[PDB]
Design a binder for this molecule. Structure first.
Ligand SMILES: *[C@@H]1O[C@H](CO)[C@@H](O[C@@H]2O[C@H](CO)[C@@H](O)[C@H](O)[C@H]2NC(C)=O)[C@H](O)[C@H]1NC(C)=O
Ligand code: NAG
Ligand code: MAN
Ligand code: MAN
Ligand code: MAN
Ligand code: CA
Ligand code: CA
Ligand code: CA
Ligand code: CA
Ligand code: CA
Ligand code: CA
Ligand code: CA
Ligand code: CA
Length: 439
């Protein structure tokens, strides 16, 4: 049976006065003489010259300064040899624990940590988990690292905290605001002995991500334009809009839409992706004598839906827009560009004479009523079937029978009608189709 005993030893200190550091004995030494041998680190394994044993007594002396960071403890393998040199006991394992000194500073893995976190996030939300390490004894004050946000260059109102010991950087409040501070540059101070010892520092950069928490609103309370009739445009106006969110993102890209007035789809809006502006297009021309004043209402949205932090606050704008439609001197023309008459079936193609086919009169476009002061006349009257009254624009027949080629085509026959203004000679044309069931 062995009898073990061992002292601790201080790192870096000269323990040459505490010798013997340990003493091992086998009770067999009473009945017979036994010699002691030892092995292991400090002796056979590197480093060497740290431990020696008194072969006769068992007093184990320490012989060199120790570094516990290199050798946190020592496992000495002792043996009790017979007078003839044979073993007499199972090799015991004598442990010498080495006491720690605070001779290693805490150190961050990275000299610059980086993280990202959304905007308006809940308090105590996690950003990043910066790390550090201390080579001194684990679960001991000398390795207990303590972190501290010391400076926040971005502003003067605090937005971050970190766990004293775990080093978790956390959101200090729901008031993270990208369009108040797009990014934060912290600086951390990790220190051992819980904070009142050695220390090193590191830097932290936090990119505050963007969300749609700002509503795009027009830079004006009202818009107005001035365009003539019978004209299309790619740009009548340009609506401006401000959006506080990160630019060139869907959280900032405006999307306009008509809330009213565009009952007839005369207008369309295209958003200028470069300037966010809204281009007011006229895709269908407007007649002055039909509507000389169109009032519209528009509203803006982002291409992205709004965040949960402001979703409820959203209501429509409905900004007034009024386009002045200006009049131009238009002339007389056939309102329908072509009329379709249908001669009855009760007639035979050999007795169509004096069949008043109907009236087909052009109209003044400065009004919308009967064109006054004109002369009505036939044009390309192929076959010579139709004749028009030069005042009432009534159309009679003046030919019967059915010649096949040219005259009659697909049950129909076609002629032009000219309306000449008494004060221009601006000859306006209309085309007269006349269905006929020859059978
Ligand atoms: C182990 O260490 C002790 C103390 O340092 C040594 O004890 C002294 O040894 C010297 C000779 O080496 C004697 O003259 C002294 O009388 C001893 N005692 C004192 C108080 O000094 C011991 O010799 C060492 N033994 C081994 C094997 O290392
Ligand atoms: C921090 O350091 C520890 C110890 O080396 C490592 O295991 C861990 O992965 C590190 N964490 C980082 C770099 O985020
Ligand atoms: C318009 O054109 C017609 C011929 O198509 C003329 O007769 C008229 O006088 C005007 O010049
Ligand atoms: C209307 O169109 C006819 C063609 O059918 C012309 O002849 C006329 O002068 C007017 O331009
Ligand atoms: C009626 O329509 C025809 C073509 O659809 C033309 O040739 C004519 O001038 C009038 O516009
Ligand atoms: Ca050390
Ligand atoms: Ca140490
Ligand atoms: Ca330390
Ligand atoms: Ca915000
Ligand atoms: Ca935002
Ligand atoms: Ca927005
Ligand atoms: Ca008109
Ligand atoms: Ca007009």
């Amino acid at each position: 049976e062995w009898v073990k005993f061992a002292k601790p030893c201080r790192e870096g200190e000269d323990n040459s006065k505490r010798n013997p550091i340990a003493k091992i004995t086998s009770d067999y030494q009473a009945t017979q003489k036994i010699t002691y041998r030892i092995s292991g680190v400090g002796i056979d394994q590197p480093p060497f010259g740290i431990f020696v044993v008194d072969k006769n007594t068992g007093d184990i002396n320490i012989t060199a300064i120790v570094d516990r960071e290199e050798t946190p403890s020592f496992l000495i393998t002792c043996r009790a040899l017979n007078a003839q040199g044979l073993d007499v006991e199972k090799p015991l394992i004598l442990t010498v624990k080495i006491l720690d000194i605070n001779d290693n500073p805490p150190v961050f893995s990275q000299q610059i940590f980086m993280g990202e976190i959304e905007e308006n996030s809940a308090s105590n939300s996690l950003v990043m988990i910066l790390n550090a390490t201390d080579a001194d004894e684990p679960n001991h004050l000398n390795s207990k690292i303590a972190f501290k946000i010391v400076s926040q260059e971005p502003a003067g109102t605090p937005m971050f905290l970190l766990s004293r010991n775990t080093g978790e950087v956390r959101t200090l409040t729901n008031s993270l605001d990208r369009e108040q501070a797009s990014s934060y540059r912290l600086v951390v101070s990790g220190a051992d002995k819980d904070g009142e010892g050695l220390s090193t520092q590191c830097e932290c950069n936090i990119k505050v991500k963007d969300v749609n928490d700002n509503f795009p609103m027009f830079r004006d309370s009202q818009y107005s334009a001035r365009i003539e009739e019978n004209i299309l445009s790619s740009e009548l106006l340009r609506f401006q809009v401000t959006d506080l969110d990160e630019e060139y993102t869907d959280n900032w890209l405006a999307v306009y839409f008509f809330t009213s007035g565009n009952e007839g789809n005369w207008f369309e809006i295209q958003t200028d992706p470069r300037t966010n502006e809204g281009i007011l297009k006229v895709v269908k021309a407007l007649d002055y004598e039909q509507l000389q004043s169109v009032k519209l209402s528009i509203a803006v949205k982002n291409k992205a839906e709004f965040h949960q932090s402001v979703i409820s606050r959203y209501r429509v704008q409905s900004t007034p827009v009024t386009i002045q439609v200006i009049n131009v001197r238009e002339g007389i023309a056939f309102r329908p560009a072509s009329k379709t008459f249908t001669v009855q079936k009760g007639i035979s193609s050999k007795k169509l004479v004096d069949y008043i086919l109907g009236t087909y009169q052009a109209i003044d476009e400065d009004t919308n009523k009967a064109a006054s002061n004109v002369k009505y006349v036939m044009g390309r009257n192929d076959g010579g079937y139709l004749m028009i009254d030069s005042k009432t624009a009534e159309i009679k027949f003046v030919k019967n029978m059915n010649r096949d080629s040219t005259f009659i085509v697909n049950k129909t026959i076609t002629a032009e009608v000219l309306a000449i203004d008494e004060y221009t000679g601006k000859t306006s044309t209309g085309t007269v189709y006349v269905r006929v069931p020859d059978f």
